[PDB]
Amino acid sequence: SWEDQEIVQGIVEPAGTAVEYGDHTNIPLTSWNANFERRTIVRGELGMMVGTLE
Amino acid sequence: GSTDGGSVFSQLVQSKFITLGVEKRAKSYVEDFSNGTAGALCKRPWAVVRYLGI
């Protein structure tokens, strides 16, 4: 939005490696971690003035 | 002269078979069952004759 200050972008790194299947072998698990980046918003302004005779 | 019934020998069985439960896991599943029995009851040991070696 125009009346904001920052744009935030998230990056998710997942993690997990497969193992050989076995019925009673313990289950491997996957996971993830997240990082974020923020960038400042810049607002530019421009105008005009018009007269009747002009 | 008794008042019980006169059963010389009896087998007191509480329950032949009970399905205790089922547990579902990700890779397998388990079931458990049970039974109950109080053994054999002899009320009149004088009415039993046992021979060994026939």
Side-chain angles (χ1 to χ4, degrees), chain B residues 34-46:
Chain B
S34 173
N35 70 341
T37 165
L41 165 72
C42 190
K43 288 191 217 170
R44 288 131 172 101
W46 56 265

Side-chain angles (χ1 to χ4, degrees), chain A residues 49-54:
Chain A
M49 183 188 294
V50 203
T52 45
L53 187 75
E54 178 224 312

Side-chain angles (χ1 to χ4, degrees), chain B residues 5-52:
Chain B
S7 321
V8 177
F9 251 111
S10 311
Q11 201 208 5
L12 328 132
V13 177
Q14 272 53 245
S15 181
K16 302 286 262 323
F17 188 73
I18 302 139
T19 302
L20 278 176
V22 184
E23 199 193 331
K24 181 76 194 118
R25 289 119 175 254
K27 280 142 79 122
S28 63
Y29 72 89
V30 193
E31 299 200 26
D32 203 279
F33 328 87
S34 173
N35 70 341
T37 165
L41 165 72
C42 190
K43 288 191 217 170
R44 288 131 172 101
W46 56 265
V48 182
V49 190
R50 321 200 290 182
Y51 287 91
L52 203 78

Side-chain angles (χ1 to χ4, degrees), chain A residues 24-45:
Chain A
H24 300 155
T25 65
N26 43 30
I27 311 186
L29 308 172
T30 62
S31 78
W32 57 267
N33 95 314
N35 274 22
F36 311 104
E37 186 73 288
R38 42 143 61 101
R39 294 270 205 274
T40 294
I41 278 164
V42 178
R43 272 170 306 278
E45 167 188 58

